[PDB]
Amino acid sequence: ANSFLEEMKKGHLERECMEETCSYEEAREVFEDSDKTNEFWNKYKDGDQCETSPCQNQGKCKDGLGEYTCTCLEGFEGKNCELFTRKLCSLDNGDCDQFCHEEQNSVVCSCARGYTLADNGKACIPTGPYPCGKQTNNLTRIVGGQECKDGECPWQALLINEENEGFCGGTILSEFYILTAAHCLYQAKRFKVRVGDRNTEQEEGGEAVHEVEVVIKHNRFTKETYDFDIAVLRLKTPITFRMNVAPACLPERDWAESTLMTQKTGIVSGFGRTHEKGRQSTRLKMLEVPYVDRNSCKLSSSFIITQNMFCAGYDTKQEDACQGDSGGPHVTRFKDTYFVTGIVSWGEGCARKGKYGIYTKVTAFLKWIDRSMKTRG
Numbered sequence: 019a020n021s022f023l024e025e026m027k028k029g030h031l032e033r034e035c036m037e038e039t040c041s042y043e044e045a046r047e048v049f050e051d052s053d054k055t056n057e058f059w060n061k062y063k064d065g066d067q068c069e070t071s072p073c074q075n076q077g078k079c080k081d082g083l084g085e086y087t088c089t090c091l092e093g094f095e096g097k098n099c100e101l102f103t104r105k106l107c108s109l110d111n112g113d114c115d116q117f118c119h120e121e122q123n124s125v126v127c128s129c130a131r132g133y134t135l136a137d138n139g140k141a142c143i144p145t146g147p148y149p150c151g152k153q154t155n156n157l158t159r160i161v162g163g164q165e166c167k168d169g170e171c172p173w174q175a176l177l178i179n180e181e182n183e184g185f186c187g188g189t190i191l192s193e194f195y196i197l198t199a200a201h202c203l204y205q206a207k208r209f210k211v212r213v214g215d216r217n218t219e220q221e222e223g224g225e226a227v228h229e230v231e232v233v234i235k236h237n238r239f240t241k242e243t244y245d246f247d248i249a250v251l252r253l254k255t256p257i258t259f260r261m262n263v264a265p266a267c268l269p270e271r272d273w274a275e276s277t278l279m280t281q282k283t284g285i286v287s288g289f290g291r292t293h294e295k296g297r298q299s300t301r302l303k304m305l306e307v308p309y310v311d312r313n314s315c316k317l318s319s320s321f322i323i324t325q326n327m328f329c330a331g332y333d334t335k336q337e338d339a340c341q342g343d344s345g346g347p348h349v350t351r352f353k354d355t356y357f358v359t360g361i362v363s364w365g366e367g368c369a370r371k372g373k374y375g376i377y378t379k380v381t382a383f384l385k386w387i388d389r390s391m392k393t394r395g
């Protein structure tokens with residue numbers, strides 16, 4: 019209790035917190051700790067709720083005033099640790115790195131080509147030295163972007179005509195396959211693809227130039243609306259991957275639509291013109307742009323936008339795709355891997371307010387590209 023000779027005497031828990039109501043301080047002094055009193059201040063007024071062993075699944079029970087706190091282990095949640103944590107591809111992507119699938123209320127993790135599923139069933143071990151998608155004041159026409167470093171952009175390639183002039187980009191998918199836009203085929207009759215390019219005016223020894231052997235455009239290409247604007251090139255010489263030459267991983271359609279396209283930002287690399295009606299960039303450059311919602315995308319476009327196109331970029335910043343990057347990939351940087359989700363299609367002006375770069379959707383065409391990699395392979 020609170021008295022004038024009681025507290026005057028050194029407080030004892032056996033002489034205050036027992037016969038008396040054990041209100042406080044006499045509930046703390048003798049204990050001289052907030053890590054022992056608070057645990058004794060709830061076992062004298064409302065009782066210890068942990069005497070019933072409520073926290074199941076070997077959880078920890080801590081006593082509080084009016085309730086108890088349960089400590090549950092990994093995969094256990096709920097008020098009293100009675101529930102297993104339901105794993106879904108919506109919540110933390112089902113812990114899968116590349117491919118998450120839902121079967122019988124269970125999460126199955128699978129890895130793309132060049133990766134093996136780990137022993138624990140969650141991680142993806144690369145199967146080779148250079149797997150896909152794995153990296154190893156500036157005025158005067160710079161659209162918010164940075165310069166591509168060595169090993170940072172190895173999946174980009176440039177197409178040059180007979181005069182060695184760059185006109186379109188390309189994404190390396192394998193030792194033989196380059197992905198670009200269909201209209202790039204109409205720009206030049208014959209062209210060569212250079213991979214590992216860092217500067218068109220300087221050969222640094224890492225650029226490999228290949229002739230194009232097989233050309234496959236989309237059959238449903240339309241000139242009026244630029245629809246189905248995608249092309250596949252099979253090169254005459256094999257691509258030997260190295261420091262500055264690496265492929266990119268092709269994701270799954272449903273996973274790309276549910277998780278990859280919900281990422282806030284993506285990356286597009288290219289050699290194209292630095293600004294509208296301007297000179298071509300001497301060196302490879304990349305730009306990070308966010309996804310644009312479909313309603314404003316269709317409201318801001320004077321032309322028809324189908325299910326195979328989407329808007330990306332900034333409404334206010336001077337940052338958007340421009341001509342010369344046609345056929346360049348739009349890639350999203352997931353936890354440890356780059357995944358292709360789009361391909362540059364076009365853009366009404368460059369760095370223009372109220373306009374967004376239109377990118378061709380890879381997901382609706384992946385099934386076709388697979389055929390293009392086995393129909394003539």
Ligand SMILES: [Ca+2]
Nearest residue numbers: 029030044047
């Ligand atoms: Ca005391």
Ligand SMILES: [Ca+2]
Nearest residue numbers: 029030034044
């Ligand atoms: Ca006391």
Ligand SMILES: [Ca+2]
Nearest residue numbers: 032033036037
């Ligand atoms: Ca006693």
Ligand SMILES: [Ca+2]
Nearest residue numbers: 024030033034
């Ligand atoms: Ca006492």
Ligand SMILES: [Ca+2]
Nearest residue numbers: 024033034037
């Ligand atoms: Ca007494």
